[PDB]
């Protein structure tokens, strides 16, 4: 998902990269660094937000999303849910599941 | 050298307070956030309440309206009453910098009740 004009939870809401990229993107397996044994949730991802993001736009905002059609106030419950979930990184995960 | 300096813990009969304080020194550019984490021997880092710079105030459902942030913006400091305890909050807390870089931890702070 790290390459221009794709899709995606990273690629729409994570961080957009432009159709007219100029660069290199390069990453390495960091099983045996990034993982513990009882689940690196140090790491952090968000699966909502209200919108999809324009290139390089960084946002750290911690609002939590209303899913519903009323509104949440800062405060979870009933279609209301944090932006970041936890990311299970493990030493005994599979490839894909792999940091 | 970001350092954040936990104080405010230790022993409390159930249905005690206290009153947990991070103060933030180092780089800490002004979009900073505040978040607070719990761990009890045997678990993971379970998150507990959140600032950000907005001052908005985000609390999991595990400890519904008992605990509360306030944030000192004179000195950027984080304040965690824990109020109306239960031996289910046994556990040591850590508090986290987001900001917009490399993130820093905590040191701990020993947080016991039981009767």
């Known amino acids: 998902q790290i390459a221009p004009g794709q899709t995606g939870k990273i690629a729409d809401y994570n961080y957009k990269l432009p159709d007219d990229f100029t660069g290199c993107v390069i990453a390495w397996n960091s099983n045996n660094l990034d993982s513990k044994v009882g689940g690196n949730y140090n790491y952090l991802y968000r699966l909502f937000r209200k919108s999809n993001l324009k290139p390089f736009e960084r946002d750290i905002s911690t609002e939590i999303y209303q899913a519903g059609s009323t509104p949440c106030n800062g405060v979870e419950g009933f279609n209301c849910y944090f932006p970041l979930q936890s990311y299970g990184f493990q030493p005994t995960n599979g490839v894909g599941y792999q940091p | 050298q970001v350092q954040l300096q936990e104080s405010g813990g230790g022993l409390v009969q159930a249905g005690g307070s206290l009153r947990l304080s991070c103060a933030a020194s180092?780089?800490?550019?002004?979009?900073?956030?505040m978040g607070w984490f719990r761990q009890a021997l045997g678990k993971q880092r379970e998150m507990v309440a959140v600032?950000?710079?907005?001052?908005?105030?985000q609390y999991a459902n595990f400890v519904k309206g008992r605990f509360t942030i306030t944030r000192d913006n004179t000195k950027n400091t984080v304040h965690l009453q824990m109020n109306s305890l239960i031996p289910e909050d046994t556990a040591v807390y850590y508090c986290?910098?987001?900001?917009?870089?490399?993130?820093?931890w905590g040191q701990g702070t020993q947080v016991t009740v039981s009767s």
């Open positions: 180092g780089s800490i550019f002004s979009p900073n956030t």
């Open positions: 986290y910098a987001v900001d917009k870089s490399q993130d820093y």
């Open positions: 600032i950000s710079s907005i001052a908005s105030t």
